[PDB]
Design a protein around this ligand. Structure first.
Ligand SMILES: CCCCCCCCCCCCCCCCCC(=O)OC[C@H](COP(=O)([O-])OCC(O)COP(=O)([O-])OC[C@@H](COC(=O)CCCCCCCCCCCCCCCCC)OC(=O)CCCCCCCCCCCCCCCCC)OC(=O)CCCCCCCCCCCCCCCCC
Ligand SMILES: CCCCCCCCCCCCCCCCCC(=O)OC[C@H](COP(=O)([O-])OCC(O)COP(=O)([O-])OC[C@@H](COC(=O)CCCCCCCCCCCCCCCCC)OC(=O)CCCCCCCCCCCCCCCCC)OC(=O)CCCCCCCCCCCCCCCCC
Ligand SMILES: CCCCCCCCCCCCCCCCCC(=O)OC[C@H](COP(=O)([O-])OCC(O)COP(=O)([O-])OC[C@@H](COC(=O)CCCCCCCCCCCCCCCCC)OC(=O)CCCCCCCCCCCCCCCCC)OC(=O)CCCCCCCCCCCCCCCCC
Ligand SMILES: CCCCCCCCCCCCCCCCC[C@@H](O)O[C@H](CO[C@H](O)CCCCCCCCCCCCCCC)COP(=O)(O)OCC[N+](C)(C)C
Ligand SMILES: CCCCCCCC/C=C\CCCCCCCC(=O)OC[C@H](COP(=O)(O)OCCN)OC(=O)CCCCCCC/C=C\CCCCCCCC
Ligand SMILES: CCCCCCCC/C=C\CCCCCCCC(=O)O[C@H](COC(=O)CCCCCCC/C=C/CCCCCCCC)COP(=O)(O)OCCN
Ligand SMILES: CCCCCCCC/C=C\CCCCCCCC(=O)O[C@H](COC(=O)CCCCCCC/C=C/CCCCCCCC)COP(=O)(O)OCCN
Ligand SMILES: CCCCCCCCCCCCCCCCCC(=O)OC[C@H](COP(=O)(O)OCCN)OC(=O)CCCCCCCCCCCCCCCCC
Ligand SMILES: CCCCCCCCCCCCCCCCCC(=O)OC[C@H](COP(=O)(O)OCCN)OC(=O)CCCCCCCCCCCCCCCCC
Ligand SMILES: Nc1ncnc2c1ncn2[C@@H]1O[C@H](COP(=O)(O)OP(=O)(O)O)[C@@H](O)[C@H]1O
Lengths: 54, 347, 459, 98, 320, 99
């Protein structure tokens, strides 16, 4: 008794990383909302030096 | 970035492009390209994040390679003629190098990957400037040297651009990558007509720039970068979605909208030169672009997607910043078909 | 033509400036006035056309189509105001704006004197139709229907644009008068074959040709009632008008290239009638009936004789009126029971007698009952086909039998039998619906009284 | 054309093929980029000096200047990438896809 | 002109505007503590601007007329209903939590804009950073779901990562039995329905997460009920917190320009509060969204922009 | 449930509030005048006036002119013994055939 309008299933079919997912593209993930990726916990690895005894 | 530094970098980008456009010396044209790239990198990196850094790195690598190939072509031409003036090139090898370098700068296929990657990397304002201005310069150089362009190479790259743009846009669901693939296809159309009528190239450039400015400014106004983000705009400002839908229809080339004028004029001009297969294939391939424009139009205006609960607060508040010339871009990109014979003024 | 074009472009601001409750009244009244004004175009000549200016001209083929378009607009307004009660004022005005824009494009399409301006307008009609379908359709499938409609039409029509610009470069002009007076034979060559194909395929897709017709059930079933009315009554006739106009420059190659299209048309006429026999949906039944009748019109244009063109014109006008009326009747039933299935609502004669009468009259015109203009057009096409060959009579007779079968099957299924017991909300027919049916059906019988007005230029 | 021009053009082609074929490091590709402009400088000055184009002798200097600007730009981007990812590897520039 | 890049170029500098008493102070505590009274006293004695707790209808108070709007149009959630039926089947609890987070974010933006445009300090009765304690209490009591918590964390990340934390965090510690006693004396039935395990979860979140996290950013002042009663010693303790190890000393003119451009634009502040994450609690259908948006448009002073509403007595529209 | 969605509304009957309704509008006065203008303009004006106008359109198709011309031609040709229908449309003297 009313016009059909899209629901969550429709929206989620439109909300993936890409249209037409494959194995690789399903392994892909959509980008972050503010385009800022979380920082990577890289190791600074300061040089260690023996200053002495000689 | 300081506002003064930002505006001086924008002016430096524009100055490099203007030097390219007004110079009569190949060295000065190369200097203009270099100045444009140098001032353009920080604009891409304006909002610091790893994606922006990666996009700026890829753009720098591609543009540096293209500039190196361009200078090699210039030097090879000087070797065989002793001429520094930009006219018909006197060596076919130098002309091929120049065509490859300018195509790599423009993003014509098979030199297109950096276009979607960089555009997705950078913000909406940076993508707007990138597409518009950075297409504006190399096309002027190509128009200057058009009389020596190899038709086979140019038309091959143009058809590749149209096909690749259509297919990539079909797959994409991010708005910036959609815009990038649309840009690749439109560059294909312009360079396809290039070896026959630089006037038609300029007409297509102007119409494309108008439609792209309107589209990018609508995205900036609505703060939408994905399909689902743009699906919430009907519940905040339904006018913007309607204008965007009309602009998308215009971009797809439907009559009687302004996007039909360049395709029409280019098909006519190529037919005058006894080209039929190429215009027919080009016209049929644009249906892919129209398909993904229509897919975008279904989500945003012709259907009402679910919204959220904080949209009520968004209703309570009002948009502050005013886009400059957005109504004019909307009108020029949709309603100037009856003004077609002004391309003679453009001549 | 400006005395008809400007009042439509003035319907636009009037619609946007009228009050919230007067939009339907204003639009209907002034649409009727514009229809009355357009009735003056029927005073045609026997020698040549009405050359109003450099841009617009009218003929015995254009004038009835313009009158039908202008008459169809107020009926669409009535049906729309039936189904759009709860809409907002802005969206009601947008719907009326789409209808007005479609009418303006159709008027300029039928009166455009250049093939390129005709192309621009006949392609411009796609946008309002697509918006109407994919926005105000009810079901999920409106989106896919719009995609099918749009891409079928564009795939058909882009090679037409290439061919038109090529012909302009070759001959210097796309003006219809000039290409008629300066026409030359089309030699049998591959280049000419593909030019012929470009033009005819554009209009065959628009018609539609059998095998290029799936977009038609998709769009006509899934569109709102006004969309269905304009899709069947007028938009299908752009193909016939274009094919009649453009075949001036395609001879004698039309004698040899018409065999595949004639075979497709005759066999698909049979096939679509047989499909109509076994359809579980009412709107799909009416859509496939439209396909069969347009197949007959394609046969008429392809055999291309003075008797076939008159039958084609008569059948196009008659089918427009009849199919619009059938869609309106089905829509009233749907607004009762909210379902398109044909066997759900039965006994509608004992629940709604006057609507049963309207169903009877519409189905009697749908099958060719003499002396209706439906029969006049069908019979002229059949006679021309008989002169073309003598087995076309076999195919035509089979088609007439199947048409009568499925028309009366639809009538008996919906109206006769016993009412469904649990459907207890069949309210008495509204004055608006009754007046809509009367305004559909009376002009058809008056056209029977004066038939030379719809027989085209060859009369 | 003398064989000297052939060798200089061959050096440019080798440096171009080096740039287009990354291995892991971004610095190595930058060095390949700097070699291309060195070959361009040498070719330009050989052409100009042979023909006695006196006013064109300043062109190789401008070429060097903009080579320096490109090298500076590339090193700046390299330090930013290394700060983000810990190495100058080009495999880390894979967040953006085509 | 309003603040913008041109004003920055001309020479409007936030550092020059500030008067070294421009401090952001946030008072925190469990449910039904004296944090409101302490915050009012602190704002009054220090000459700062008081910001009452941002509940529902705060955005209503800051826009149009100050009068609150219909609950159907502003919030679509009920604190009283959350107390009555915490485990509802319509997602009322998480709808309320997300709306209150958005309101607190908007209020923090308002306070920062006031401080940056005036130089006068602000005293907020609760901030963005203390909002999650109720989320943890709801999750540990089974009121909301793990998906709700994940959506909250996503929005909080992308939103609160952009602002400057408070200068001073003043926490009022009141034991749970005393909290229940005060709640019972207050006599409101809905808050009398609060269980003791819910109150303990909020305190556990405050003591274990919020207070340790805010200690790294700057200094945290903790008081009992008796100490919070005497606000003079609280203001004296505030006035001698000369140390400042937060990002405020690191802030420069360009960073302040960026922050002020952000906080003067309320639609960009709330940009990520509506992300297309389709939780059943917060997602609203197309038809209900259309109906409610039409009703809000039909509201008296809401159809057009503020200066252009003729039904509320705006004139000279044709020249405006 | 996956959304906060409105229930599907009950169908609205125009005869409940207004028993003598024409189906045009919810408002009785607007509904009555919509019926009146549709009936008057459409039926009376367009049907009657357009039908009589089309019936009495001037004979610009030249049917009766052609009949009178044919009668004159037949009378003249049968008076003089000429064939009633000429064998050729054009003058063979004016036509010049190739050798
Ligand atoms: C002294 C020398 C002269 C100086 C004149 C005044 C300029 C400086 C004023 C200033 O301080 O501005 C601060 C401001 C920086 O402040 P900010 O807070 O850092 O920036 C906020 C962002 O802009 C926030 O982003 P946004 O969303 O505000 O985007 C702003 C802008 C960012 O984008 C651009 O600036 C785009 C630049 C042009 C793009 C291509 C246009 C079309 C080209 C083809 C034309 C073919 C014909 O984009 C637009 O405004 C888009 C619409 C306008 C372009 C329409 C063109 C139609 C032709 O600087 C600018 O806006 C730069 C303007 C530079 C103009 C140089 C040429 C004149
Ligand atoms: C002049 C009349 C119009 C003729 C049009 C012909 C073409 C002109 C193109 C440019 C027109 C100018 C720009 C108008 C923008 C209007 C935007 C707007 O807010 O409209 C609503 C607005 C009133 O509503 P509102 O209070 O603003 O509330 C808006 C809320 O959204 C209300 O809340 P809501 O939620 O209920 O509203 C939602 C609604 C709100 O959405 C809208 O209002 C958007 C409307 C469409 C966007 C603008 C498109 C412009 C591009 C060109 C194509 C336009 C064709 C349609 C034109 C519609 C004009 C309203 O959106 C939807 O429902 C979504 C529907 C999505 C599908 C339909 C939209 C796209 C249609 C166009 C595509 C098809 C083009 C086909 C190709 C051929 C083109 C010619 O309407 C007007 O103000 C009417 C404008 C005209 C007034 C009369 C002017 C003439 C006065 C008398 C002159 C006398 C001359 C002398 C005669 C001699 C005797 C004295
Ligand atoms: C006439 C209109 C016919 C169609 C609309 C019918 C409306 C209706 O419901 O009527 C029943 C209704 C009777 O009341 P009721 O029985 O309570 O109604 C309840 C049920 O509807 C009762 O339902 P029902 O079952 O009693 O329905 C009776 C009738 C209702 O249906 C019909 O009347 C439909 C008739 C047409 C069928 C479809 C078309 C078939 C092909 C022929 C097309 C051209 C026809 C001729 C040209 C017509 C030009 C107008 O249907 C039939 O009797 C079945 C007829 C089957 C076909 C007959 C054989 C084919 C035709 C053969 C002859 C063709 C003519 C040329 C002959 C050549 C040699 C001379 O009629 C009226 O009340 C009439 C009043 C309204 C109309 C007249 C208004 C007054 C003005 C009159 C003069 C106007 C000019 C100005 C004068 C100024 C001084
Ligand atoms: C209770 C009812 C019982 C049933 C009664 C009805 C059934 C009986 C029908 C048979 C009787 C017919 C009566 C005929 C009376 C004579 C009048 C008629 O013959 O005139 C016609 C006149 O034609 C009609 O006007 C038909 C008009 C066609 C409709 C025009 C459009 C109306 C506007 C609606 C727009 C619809 C557009 C649809 C696409 C075009 C035919 O032309 P003609 O007899 O020699 O004209 C005579 C005048 N002369 C001598 C000067 C030439
Ligand atoms: C896969 C295979 C596809 C087969 C179907 C063809 C559709 C793809 C289009 C690709 C082009 C096809 C070749 C067109 C023929 C051509 O180019 O030349 C035709 C001819 C030659 O021109 P000249 O160079 O001047 O020759 C002079 C000789 N001295 O030029 C013309 O006459 C103009 C004809 C326009 C070409 C139209 C293309 C023909 C396609 C038929 C249209 C059918 C599509 C309809 C789609 C219906 C489905 C919705
Ligand atoms: C808005 C500023 C003016 C805009 C100019 C209008 C647009 C034209 C394009 C720019 C042209 C600028 C003119 C500079 C070119 C001068 C060339 C010249 O004429 O040579 C000198 C000019 O004389 C000078 O010394 C001029 C010195 C100027 C130094 C200061 C210039 C300011 C530059 C500001 C830097 C801005 C950056 C520009 C962006 C990059 C470029 C696109 C004269 O030599 P003579 O010996 O007299 O020749 C006759 C032989 N007997
Ligand atoms: C033989 C032909 C002669 C016919 C002449 C007809 C001339 C017009 C007579 C019919 C007009 C109907 C109304 C006449 C006077 C109005 C009576 C009245 O007072 O009622 C009004 C009627 O109002 C209306 O319904 C509006 C309809 C009247 C105006 C529309 C008619 C204008 C037509 C102009 C015709 C000129 C066209 C000629 C050029 C051709 C253009 C193509 C109030 O009703 P509402 O407004 O709906 O009530 C709600 C208020 N609370
Ligand atoms: C030569 C430069 C041309 C472009 C200049 C554009 C400047 C404005 C850009 C912002 C967007 C448009 C303005 C919208 C309103 C802005 C807010 C406002 O209230 O503005 C008031 C302003 C009053 O006009 P005012 O500034 O006094 O005029 C210049 C006086 N020296 O109101 C206005 O100015 C409104 C009218 C603006 C002019 C019409 C829009 C451009 C017309 C171009 C004509 C040619 C068509 C092709 C254009 C191609 C793209 C430029
Ligand atoms: C899997 C693949 C499925 C393919 C399905 C195809 C269906 C069949 C379509 C045609 C059916 C009838 C065929 C009639 C035929 O073969 O006609 C040949 C015709 C006459 O040529 P000819 O007899 O040699 O004349 C020389 C002079 N004596 O020759 C000609 O007229 C010349 C060629 C004309 C045809 C050109 C192409 C158009 C084909 C028809 C329209 C196609 C689109 C619609 C069909 C359905 C598509 C789904
Ligand atoms: N994020 C939230 N979620 C649920 N309820 C909240 C939230 N924030 C505040 N409230 C409610 O708002 C009311 C505010 O009371 P409060 O101001 O703490 O009392 P007092 O003014 O005595 O300190 C409390 O009943 C509390 O339950």
């Amino acid at each position: 008794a009313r016009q059909w309008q899209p629901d969550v299933e429709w929206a989620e079919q439109f909300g993936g990383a890409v249209m037409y997912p494959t194995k690789e593209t399903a392994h892909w993930k959509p980008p972050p909302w503010n385009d800022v990726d979380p920082p990577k916990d890289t190791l600074v690895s300061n040089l260690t030096l023996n200053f002495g005894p000689q | 970035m300081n506002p003064i530094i930002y505006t001086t970098l924008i002016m430096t980008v524009m100055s490099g492009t203007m030097l390219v456009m007004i110079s009569s010396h190949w060295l000065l044209i190369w200097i203009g390209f270099e100045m444009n790239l140098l001032a353009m990198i920080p604009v891409l990196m304006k909002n610091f994040n790893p994606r922006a850094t990666e996009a700026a790195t890829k753009y720098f690598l591609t543009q540096a390679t293209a500039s190196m190939m361009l200078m090699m072509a210039i030097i090879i031409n000087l070797l065989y003629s002793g001429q520094w003036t930009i006219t018909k090139m006197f060596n076919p090898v130098a002309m091929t190098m120049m065509t490859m370098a300018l195509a790599m700068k423009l993003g014509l296929s098979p030199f297109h990957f950096w276009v979607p990657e960089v555009t997705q990397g950078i913000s909406l304002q940076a993508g707007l400037l990138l597409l518009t201005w950075q297409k504006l310069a190399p096309l002027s150089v190509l128009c200057q040297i058009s009389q020596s362009i190899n038709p086979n190479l140019m038309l091959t790259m143009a058809m590749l651009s149209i096909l690749i743009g259509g297919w990539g846009g079909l797959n994409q669901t991010q708005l910036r990558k959609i815009m990038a693939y649309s840009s690749i296809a439109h560059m294909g159309w312009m360079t396809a007509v290039l070896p026959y009528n630089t006037t038609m190239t300029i007409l297509n450039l102007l119409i494309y720039i108008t439609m792209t400015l309107a589209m990018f400014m609508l995205l900036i106004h609505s703060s939408a970068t994905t399909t689902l983000s743009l699906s919430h705009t009907w519940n905040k400002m339904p006018v913007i979605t309607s204008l965007m839908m009309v602009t998308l229809l215009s971009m797809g080339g439907l009559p009687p909208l302004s996007g039909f004028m360049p395709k029409w004029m280019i098909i006519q001009e190529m037919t005058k030169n006894e080209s039929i297969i190429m215009p027919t294939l080009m016209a049929m391939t644009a249906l892919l672009n129209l398909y993904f424009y229509m897919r975008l139009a279904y989500s945003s205006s012709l259907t009402m997607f679910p919204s959220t609960n904080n949209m009520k607060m968004k209703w309570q508040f009002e948009h502050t910043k005013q886009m400059k010339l957005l109504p004019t871009m909307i009108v020029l990109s949709t309603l100037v078909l009856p003004m077609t014979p002004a391309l003679s003024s453009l001549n | 033509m400006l005395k008809i074009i400007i009042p439509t472009t003035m319907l636009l601001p009037m619609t946007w400036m009228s009050k919230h409750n007067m939009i339907w009244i204003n639009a209907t009244v002034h649409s009727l006035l514009i229809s009355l004004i357009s009735l003056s175009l029927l005073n045609q000549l026997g020698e040549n056309s009405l050359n109003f200016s450099l841009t617009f001209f009218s003929d015995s083929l254009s004038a009835p189509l313009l009158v039908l378009t202008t008459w169809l607009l107020p009926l669409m307004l009535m049906a729309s105001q039936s189904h759009l009660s709860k809409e907002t004022t802005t969206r009601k005005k947008l719907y009326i704006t789409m209808l007005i824009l479609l009418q303006l494009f159709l008027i300029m399409t039928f009166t455009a004197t250049e093939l390129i301006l005709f192309y621009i307008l006949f392609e411009a009609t796609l946008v309002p139709t697509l918006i109407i379908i994919t926005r105000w359709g009810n079901q999920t499938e409106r989106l896919n229907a719009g995609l099918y409609f749009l891409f079928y039409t564009l795939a058909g029509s882009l090679p037409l644009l290439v061919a038109l610009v090529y012909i302009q470069n070759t001959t210097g002009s796309l003006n219809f008068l000039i290409i008629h007076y300066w026409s030359h034979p089309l030699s049998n060559s591959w280049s000419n074959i593909f030019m012929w194909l470009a033009c005819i395929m554009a209009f065959m897709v628009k018609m539609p040709l059998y095998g290029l017709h799936l977009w038609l059930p998709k769009a006509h079933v899934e569109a709102p009632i006004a969309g269905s009315m304009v899709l069947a009554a007028v938009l299908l006739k752009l193909g016939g008008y274009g094919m009649m106009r453009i075949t001036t420059i395609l001879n004698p190659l039309t004698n040899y290239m018409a065999y595949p299209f004639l075979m497709l048309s005759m066999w698909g006429m049979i096939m679509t009638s047989s499909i109509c026999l076994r359809q579980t949906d009412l709107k799909s039944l009416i859509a496939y009936s439209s396909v069969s009748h347009m197949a007959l019109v394609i046969v008429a244009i392809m055999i291309q004789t003075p008797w076939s063109f008159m039958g084609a014109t008569a059948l196009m006008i008659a089918h427009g009126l009849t199919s619009s009326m059938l869609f309106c009747l089905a829509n009233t039933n749907y607004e009762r029971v909210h379902s398109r299935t044909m066997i759900l609502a039965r006994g509608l004669q004992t629940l709604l007698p006057l609507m049963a009468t309207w169903w009877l009259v519409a189905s009697l015109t749908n099958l060719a009952l003499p002396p209706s203009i439906n029969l006049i057009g069908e019979l002229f096409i059949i006679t021309a086909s008989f002169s073309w060959s003598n087995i076309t009579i076999i195919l035509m007779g089979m088609n007439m039998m199947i048409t009568a079968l499925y028309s009366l099957y639809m009538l008996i299924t919906t109206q006769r039998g016993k009412y469904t017991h649990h459907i207890n909300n069949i309210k008495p027919s509204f004055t608006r619906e009754n007046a809509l049916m009367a305004l559909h059906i009376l002009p058809l019988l008056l056209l029977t009284l004066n038939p030379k007005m719809i027989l085209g230029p060859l009369y | 054309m003398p064989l000297v021009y052939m060798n200089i053009i061959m050096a440019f082609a080798i440096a171009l093929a080096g740039l287009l074929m990354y291995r892991s490091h971004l610095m190595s590709s930058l060095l390949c980029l700097e070699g291309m402009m060195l070959s361009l400088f040498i070719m330009s000055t050989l052409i100009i000096l042979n023909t006695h184009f006196t006013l064109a002798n300043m062109m190789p200097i401008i070429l060097l200047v903009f080579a320096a600007c490109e090298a500076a730009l590339g090193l700046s981007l390299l330090v930013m990438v290394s700060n983000t990812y810990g190495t100058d590897y080009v495999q880390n520039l894979n967040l953006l896809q085509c | 002109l309003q603040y913008g890049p041109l004003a920055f170029v001309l020479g409007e500098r936030t550092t020059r505007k500030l008067t070294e008493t421009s401090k952001v102070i946030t008072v925190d505590g469990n449910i039904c503590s004296g944090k409101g009274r302490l915050a009012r006293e602190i704002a009054e004695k220090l000459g700062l601007r008081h910001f009452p707790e941002a509940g529902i209808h705060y955005a209503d108070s800051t826009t149009g007329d100050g009068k609150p709007l219909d609950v159907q149009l502003s919030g679509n959630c009920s604190l009283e209903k959350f107390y009555d039926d915490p485990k509802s089947n319509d997602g009322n609890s998480y709808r309320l939590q997300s709306w209150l987070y958005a309101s607190r974010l908007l209020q923090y933006a308002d306070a920062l804009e006031h401080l940056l445009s005036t130089g006068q300090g602000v005293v907020l009765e609760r901030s963005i950073y203390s909002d999650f304690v109720f989320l943890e209490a709801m999750y540990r009591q089974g009121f909301i779901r793990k998906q709700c918590v994940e959506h909250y964390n996503e929005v909080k990340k992308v939103t609160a990562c952009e602002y400057l934390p408070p200068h001073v965090v003043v926490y009022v510690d009141v034991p749970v039995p005393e909290i229940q006693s005060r709640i019972q004396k207050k006599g409101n039935p809905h808050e009398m329905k609060i269980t003791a395990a819910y109150l303990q979860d909020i305190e556990n979140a405050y003591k274990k997460t919020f207070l340790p996290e805010m200690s790294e950013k700057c200094e945290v002042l903790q008081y009992s009920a008796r100490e919070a009663e005497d606000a003079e010693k609280v203001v004296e303790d505030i006035e001698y917190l000369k140390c400042d190890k937060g990002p405020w000393p690191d802030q420069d003119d360009r960073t302040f320009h960026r922050l002020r451009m952000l906080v003067q634009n309320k639609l960009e502040v709330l940009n990520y509060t509506t992300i297309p994450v389709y939780l059943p609690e917060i997602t609203i259908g197309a038809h209900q969204s259309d109906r409610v948006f039409q009703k809000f448009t039909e509201l008296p002073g809401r159809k057009y922009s503020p200066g252009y509403n003729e039904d509320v007595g705006d004139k000279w529209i044709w020249l405006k | 449930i996956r959304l906060q969605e409105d229930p599907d509304p009950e169908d609205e009957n125009l005869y409940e509030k207004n028993p003598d309704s024409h189906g045009y509008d919810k408002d009785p006065i607007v509904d009555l005048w919509n019926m009146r203008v549709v009936f008057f303009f459409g039926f009376s004006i367009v049907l009657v006036l357009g039908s009589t106008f089309v019936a009495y359109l001037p004979d610009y198709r030249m049917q009766e002119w052609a009949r009178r011309e044919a009668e004159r031609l037949v009378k003249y040709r049968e008076a003089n013994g000429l064939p009633l229908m000429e064998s050729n449309c054009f003058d063979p003297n004016k036509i010049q055939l190739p050798e």
